[PDB]
Structures are given as C-alpha cells and as structure tokens.
Design an enzyme around this catalytic site. Structure first.
Site, PDB file in Angstrom:
ATOM      1  N   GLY B  69     -35.820  -2.716 -42.664  1.00  0.00           N
ATOM      2  CA  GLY B  69     -37.056  -2.313 -42.026  1.00  0.00           C
ATOM      3  C   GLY B  69     -36.883  -1.129 -41.099  1.00  0.00           C
ATOM      4  O   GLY B  69     -37.694  -0.917 -40.192  1.00  0.00           O
ATOM      5  N   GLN B  70     -35.821  -0.357 -41.311  1.00  0.00           N
ATOM      6  CA  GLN B  70     -35.567   0.812 -40.484  1.00  0.00           C
ATOM      7  C   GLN B  70     -36.606   1.894 -40.758  1.00  0.00           C
ATOM      8  O   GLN B  70     -37.215   1.948 -41.831  1.00  0.00           O
ATOM      9  N   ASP B  71     -36.813   2.758 -39.761  1.00  0.00           N
ATOM     10  CA  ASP B  71     -37.766   3.852 -39.916  1.00  0.00           C
ATOM     11  C   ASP B  71     -37.338   4.807 -41.022  1.00  0.00           C
ATOM     12  O   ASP B  71     -38.169   5.263 -41.817  1.00  0.00           O
ATOM     13  N   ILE B  73     -35.573   3.979 -43.544  1.00  0.00           N
ATOM     14  CA  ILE B  73     -35.572   3.234 -44.798  1.00  0.00           C
ATOM     15  C   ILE B  73     -36.941   2.683 -45.164  1.00  0.00           C
ATOM     16  O   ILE B  73     -37.103   2.145 -46.270  1.00  0.00           O
ATOM     17  N   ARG B  74     -37.928   2.789 -44.272  1.00  0.00           N
ATOM     18  CA  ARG B  74     -39.274   2.323 -44.595  1.00  0.00           C
ATOM     19  C   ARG B  74     -39.884   3.059 -45.778  1.00  0.00           C
ATOM     20  O   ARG B  74     -40.447   2.398 -46.667  1.00  0.00           O
TER      21      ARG B  74
END
Ligand SMILES: Nc1nc2c(ncn2[C@@H]2O[C@H](COP(=O)(O)OP(=O)(O)OP(=O)(O)O)[C@@H](O)[C@H]2O)c(=O)[nH]1
Ligand SMILES: [Mg+2]
Lengths: 415, 180, 18, 177
Positions: B69-71, B73-74
């Site tokens: 849920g990383q920015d 990786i979103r």
C-alpha cells in the site's frame, strides 16, 4: 581492472558481452574495429587499443578477439591473465573455440562469465572446480573454492590409482645464417595426468643439480634447470626451503612444473643447405640433414621445412631418405621423414624453375625449421627419482611417466 | 474433437482459480497471506515490491498476489490487473485517517474497464482491537452496495487468531466456481 | 605402445638419501 | 513477435516462461533492443528454477540504467532472495544488487549488504565484499554512511583466504578512488 569483457568476431560483431563495472559505454566496441583496422594498415596495431579515455586490451583467439574494455589504470597483466583463464575455461567446456559455440552455448556462457569475475576482479578460474557449479545440461558451490585447496576436489574415488606423467622436451635452436647457433635453449615440461582416489599429496623428486649439491651428491648427471615454474598445487615455500616439491595433484591432466635451462650441446639435427638459385633461370637446394643425436633414439616424424621460392613452379626433388613434397600454400619444401635413426644422413637436391619476369617486391628469407620428435630421449638428462604419493586412507599408487623429445623453436636462419 | 481427458481431470478436480491481495500498507495483507499459506503470524518488513504465493484448498489453487500500500506502489496495481480473475481488498479499520485513502484507492482500482470480472472481496483486517468496526459499518462507509455489477462480500478476519479465513475462502470458491 | 616413448614407472622417493 | 513473447512470458506455464526468457536473452545478445519488455519480465522474476532467475537478473542488470523507473519493482525480490538458504542464490542476488546502476535502488540495498557482510559462506562473504566495493564506487557517501569500511577491514583478519583476498582487493579499490 577490466570494465566490460566482450567477445568479438571476424566481422566486427560482438558475439557476447558482459559488463563488470559499467564505467565504459557498450557503444565503444563499435570503434574498436575501425581502430584495429587503422592500426593494422599502418603497422601500429597492438593487442591493447585506446579509444580516447578507454583502452581496449584483448588477445586474438581462433575466430574472435576477446577484447576487454577498461578506463582506469587497470593491470594489463591481470587483464591478459583473465583473458587466458577465460580462453582455457572455454576450451575445457567447449572442444572448439569458434562462432559455432558462441551462439549455441549462450545460456551457460553467460553464467560462466558472471561467475568467473565480479566487478572486474576474477574469483574462480578452475575448469574442474567450475564444472561442479555451472553446467549446460544448480546445487550449492563446492567447498573446494571456499577451502584453500581450489585445484583438487575432495571425495574423488577411482577403481585404480594410476598417474601418467609426460616429460616433454622442447629443443629450440636459433642458428644464424653464418652457421652458428645463437639461441639454443631447452624448456622442460612435466605434464602429469593424475587419476587417483582421494586427495593425495604428491612429493615430486628428481635429480636436480641444486638438490644433489645440497644432499652432497653433486657429482652425477643432474639437470641444471635455470628457471623452474611450479604449478598452483606445488608449494612455493616448500620448494624455496629445501627444494621440496610437494603438492596435491589435480584430477585430470595439468602442468606441474615447467623447467627452462640453456643448452650448450650440439644440435640433435644439423641441416647443411645450399641455395644455387640462378638469376630467373632455376634454383638448387643441396640440403643435407645430419643427425647428431644418439643412434639408439629415432626421430619419428622428422619434418625439416625448407623455404623454397614463392613463385617457383615445376619443382623436382632428388632426395635419399624420406618423401619430399612442396606445398604452394606454405611456399616451402617439406622434407618429411617418417623414421630418422640417430646418426643418419639424408641428402636432398632440390630443382625448381623460376619465371623470367622478376618479382615486383621482395619476399624475404624465412628461416628453415625442423620438426624432429625423438621419443624416449631426454636431451637435458633429467630423470625422475621418486614420486611420494601419500594418502590418509592408504593405498598403493602406480605412477607412470614417459620422456618425449621434440623440436621447439628449432629454426635455422637462411643465407 | 474429444474431451475425455478433460472429463477425467475434472472427475477428481481440475479448476484452480486465482486471487489478488491489494490494500493499504500495514493492513494485515502480508500476515493474512502468510496465515492462509502457512498458518502463522509472521512479522515481515513493509512490502516495497510485491509478494506472490499460492494456497491449495478445496482442490482449487488459490494463488495470492500480495500488493503493498505504499505511495510509490499504489499506481503499480495495474500491472497485476492483466490476466487476473480475482481481487481481494484488505481494509484498515484501525486507521480512521487512512480509511478514506483506502476507500479512494479501492474506488480508483474498481473504476477500470479492464478489471470487470474480478468480484469484490472485502476482508476486515486487524479485527483484534475494540476500535475495529463491524461487518456493516465498514461496508456502509465504503459504499460497497453502490458498486453496480460487482459481487462484493465483507468478511472479518483476525490476523492474530485467523478466524473467518475459512469462511472467506469458501465464499471466494462459491463465487468463482458455480458447480456442485 | 604409444608414440613419443613408452611410459615408465616412477619411484616413490630417493631411497639412497634416506 | 513482441506481443507473442509478452504473452508467453505472462503465462502460467514454466516451459513457456523459460523459452521466452531464453529468446529474450538471445535477442539481446543478437543485438535487439529488448528494454521495452523490461516491465513484462519483472512479473516472471520470482521463480523457483535457478536457470531462469539468472537470465532475469542479467536482463535487469543490462536493462537497469535504460529503465531506472521500472527497476523499482525489484527491491523486494532482491531482499527476499538475499536470505535464501542456498549460497549460490544469495551470491547471485548480491552480485545483481551491486550490478544495478540505480541511484534509488542502492540506498535500500545497504541492509542486504550489511546482512551478507558477516555471512558464514565464503562465497557469500566474497559476494558481499564485491558488492560493498561496487556500492562504494557507485556511491562513496552511501558506503561511508553504511560503515562498510570497518566490516571490510575485519575481513582481511578472518578465515577464508579467498574471501580475505577479495576483501583486500575491495579495500584497495575503495582507497584507490
Ligand atoms: N498485532 C497485530 N497486528 C496486526 C494485526 N493485523 C494487522 N496488523 C498490522 O498489520 C501489519 C501487517 O503487515 P504485513 O503482514 O507485513 O503485510 P501488509 O499488511 O501488506 O503490510 P505492508 O507490508 O506494510 O504492506 C503488521 O505490521 C501489524 O502491525 C493483528 O491482528 N494483530
Ligand atoms: Mg505485505
């Protein structure tokens, strides 16, 4: 300190490339071919090129040039050693070194290139050790690479313990046109094919002059090896201490020691050749071969190459022993003799025509080189004394060795 | 043509199916995947990239592709949208401030015309603290009933305990497989 | 047989030097 | 061609994935710009077979500077592979991490390098020593911050003569610059 090890071809196409540091652009290989062409056409071609701030140091292979680009002040000797190790590994893995295997063994070639050197610093170069971790037909790396003994894999077992040695002699003679020999050196080569069980520690013992003097027996026939180059398995400290040659033989055929000492004796084969070449009319080759070697030794496959004229045609050979054939590809008369007993004398009388029109440019006078090879004859007189094969388990070894005498740089300067 | 081999394979089980693992970071997605695959609460570093695993249950190979849920990786969830048949959404009921972000991300991922056959799979992760909502308050806040042509199901799963994972797997199998 | 000289067995060590 | 290769690489069959990887490797060696398919090969990277992992790592290393943005999808895979029980896999992962010329990737590779610096496997120790020198050459400040000089110095005074020589060479290269 190579930046990118790449393999070229005869048409300038890079068969395979493997960058190790990335400090050199991959497009610099394109300028290597024009630079090599310019160097060759001006006589300034060298194995190490220079494309601006990047040096392209590589050797010439059978079909491709293994050029390794570099940018910093990397060790040229180290790069040459790495290239030689890569060539040896390729020869061990692939029986042929040509473009046929470069485009067909890429899957294993890339893995071997990646494992051989990392960041320009090679770490593994043993073909036998490397064959246990990288195969074209993967388990954990063997402990031999991590262990000190990186040239003898542990756990090797054989039905019999037989080690075959090969004392190959290299008779090199540099005879000037005046009839005297300038460079007359004999380089020994002790190549052994060790096939035993376990990891025996071979203790090589020969009748060395230094060893005989140290032991007090410096009065018999002792080989005076000026330079002795032991293999990696041979312990340098043991040899430096008391001339003790103790090392673990590898699994397969390898070079243990390479002796090299000067020779002050008469040449085994003496060639007395004359050139009665008429001015654009004919030519005569009164070549006589005198065997100065012992009569008990026979020089099998004796081939004394006599350089005939390049444009000579309709040649006739009047010899006594051995077939004489002229090969237009080599532009020389091959005095091939099957069996050459010691003390024999073969006389030949060449006779070939010459065109009336003179040649436009000179062709030079290539030296005459003989291809004598007399087995069971040691010119240096060095004889193996003992081979201490010691194993922890305990077994009775059956070492073997043969002495072969051949001709190395045995060239004779022409008049 | 002959389909005897297919019938023989299906007589003992042939369907495998797929699944997706998406949601906000620290939402129990990696822990839920580890529990589904192994059955233990394994502590792992934040998923910088992605995790791919498979689960064998009910004769169906439920492959799970964990997505962080990383920015950074979103927006990378579109890479797994190709050749994807299922999708599992992991909600974070313990993050009131991140609940809106998770709902927005789910709406953005559900607003693509390429991902239409993937049924909704809402998993109530972090179901161990009193601040966690029920199975209807979270759905009402996320508006799961307003997703036209979307078969969504809200299930509460405790990362530490593992309860409700079997019910979610059974629901996913029933939604994917329409046979006896 | 073999070209280049028949192979000969080698000793174990200098027995005359102890 | 390209579409067929992408479809083969995005399949669930290992026999087709291996063939696609081999074709991609051959195309790059034959002189084909296959950097456009780097994101497609990223999905087929975490594979159990060691034959395809090496090809994927080589493609990523050769296609890292060309597409640095697409290389951000491999840090997790490298971290996962840096703890494999097999020493060969760990050594390959360490070599590939240092071979990638990515400014945003070497920063997160400090932890795997520190973990592999004290690895018991001599091959792993040599791979970590090589990766430390590669990172220092790529980023001297990052290497100094990570405190790899102290670990490199202690390498020479430890066992594993090959690993000791590798550490000495890495220290000499770092001090050379
Ligand atoms: N103690 C506890 N922590 C939980 C529980 N459920 C979720 N968490 C938190 O959720 C996180 C789960 O992270 P991971 O399992 O590594 O995978 P993830 O959910 O995708 O998180 P990221 O890797 O950051 O994307 C943990 O770090 C926990 O802090 C739970 O039931 N008990
Ligand atoms: Mg995770």
């Amino acid at each position: 300190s190579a930046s990118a090890v790449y393999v070229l071809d005869l048409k300038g196409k890079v068969l395979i490339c493997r960058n190790y540091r990335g400090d050199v652009d991959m497009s610099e290989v394109e300028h290597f071919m024009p630079i090599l062409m310019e160097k060759e056409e001006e006589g300034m071609l060298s194995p190490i090129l220079a494309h601006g701030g990047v040096r392209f140091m590589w050797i010439k292979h059978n079909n491709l040039y293994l050029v390794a680009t570099s940018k910093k002040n990397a060790c040229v000797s180290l790069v040459f050693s790495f290239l030689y190790k890569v060539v040896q590994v390729f020869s061990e893995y692939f029986k042929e070194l040509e473009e046929e295997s470069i485009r067909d063994n890429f899957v294993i070639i890339y893995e071997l290139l990646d494992e051989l050197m990392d960041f320009g610093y090679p770490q593994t170069t043993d073909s036998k050790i490397l064959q246990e971790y990288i195969t074209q037909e993967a388990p954990r790396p063997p402990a031999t690479v991590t262990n000190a003994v990186s040239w003898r894999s542990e756990g090797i077992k054989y039905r019999k313990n037989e080690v075959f040695l090969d004392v190959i002699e290299a008779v090199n003679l540099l005879v000037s046109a005046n009839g005297n020999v300038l460079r007359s050196e004999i380089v020994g080569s002790i190549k052994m094919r060790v096939f035993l069980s376990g990891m025996p520690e071979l203790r090589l013992g020969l009748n060395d002059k230094v060893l005989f003097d140290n032991t007090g027996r410096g009065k018999s026939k002792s080989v005076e090896l000026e330079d002795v180059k032991f293999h990696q398995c041979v312990r340098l400290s043991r040899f430096e201490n008391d001339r003790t040659i103790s090392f673990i033989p590898p699994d397969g055929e390898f070079e243990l020691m390479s002796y090299r000492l000067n020779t002050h004796v008469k040449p085994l084969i003496w060639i007395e050749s004359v050139i009665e070449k008429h001015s654009h009319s004919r030519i005569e080759y009164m070549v006589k071969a005198k065997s100065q070697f012992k009569r008990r030794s026979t020089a099998n496959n004796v081939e004394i190459h006599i350089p005939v004229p390049n444009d000579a045609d309709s040649p006739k050979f009047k010899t006594t022993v051995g077939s004489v054939k002229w090969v237009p590809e080599n532009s020389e008369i091959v005095w091939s003799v099957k069996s050459f007993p010691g003390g024999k004398e073969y006389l030949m009388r060449a006779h070939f025509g010459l065109p009336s029109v003179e040649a436009e440019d000179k062709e030079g006078k290539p030296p005459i080189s003989v291809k004598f090879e007399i087995p069971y004859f040691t010119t240096s007189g060095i004889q193996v004394r003992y081979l201490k094969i010691i194993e922890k388990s305990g077994y009775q070894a059956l070492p073997w060795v043969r002495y072969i005498t051949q001709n190395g740089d045995y060239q004779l300067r022409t008049q | 043509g002959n389909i005897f081999a297919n019938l023989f394979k299906g007589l003992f089980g042939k369907k495998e199916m797929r699944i997706l693992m998406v949601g906000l970071d620290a939402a129990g997605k990696t822990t839920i995947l580890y529990k589904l695959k192994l059955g233990e609460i394994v502590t792992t570093i934040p998923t910088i990239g992605f995790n791919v695993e498979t689960v064998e249950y009910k004769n169906i190979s439920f492959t799970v592709w964990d997505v962080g849920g990383q920015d950074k990786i979103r927006p990378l969830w579109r890479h797994y949208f190709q050749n994807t048949q299922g999708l599992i959404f992991v909600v974070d009921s313990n993050d009131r401030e991140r609940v809106n972000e998770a709902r927005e991300e789910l709406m953005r991922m559900l607003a693509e015309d390429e991902l239409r056959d993937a049924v909704l799979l809402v998993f109530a992760n972090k179901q161990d603290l009193p601040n966690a909502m029920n199975a209807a308050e979270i759905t009402d806040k996320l508006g799961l009933h307003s997703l036209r042509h979307r078969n969504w199901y809200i299930q509460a799963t405790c990362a530490t305990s593992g309860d409700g994972l079997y019910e979610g797997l059974d629901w996913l199998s029933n939604q994917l497989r329409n046979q006896k | 047989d073999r070209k280049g000289g028949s192979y000969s067995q080698a000793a174990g060590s200098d027995s005359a030097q102890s | 061609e390209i579409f067929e290769l992408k479809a083969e690489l995005n399949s669930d069959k290992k026999e087709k994935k291996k063939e696609a990887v081999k074709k991609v490797i051959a195309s790059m060696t034959v002189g084909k710009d296959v950097s456009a398919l780097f994101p497609d090969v990223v999905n087929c990277m975490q594979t159990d077979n060691l034959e395809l992992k090496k090809l994927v790592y080589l493609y990523l290393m050769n296609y890292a500077k060309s597409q640095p943005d697409m290389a951000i999808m491999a840090v997790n895979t490298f971290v996962k592979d840096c703890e494999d029980p097999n020493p060969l896999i760990r050594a390959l992962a360490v070599r590939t991490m240092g071979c990638i010329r990515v400014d945003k990737i070497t920063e997160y590779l400090c932890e795997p390098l520190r973990k592999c610096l004290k690895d018991e496997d001599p091959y792993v120790r040599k791979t970590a020593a090589v990766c430390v020198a590669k990172l220092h050459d790529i980023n001297a400040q990052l290497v100094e911050d990570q405190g790899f000089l102290d670990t490199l110095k202690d390498l020479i005074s430890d066992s594993n003569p090959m690993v000791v020589a590798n550490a000495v060479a890495a220290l000499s290269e770092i001090a050379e610059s």
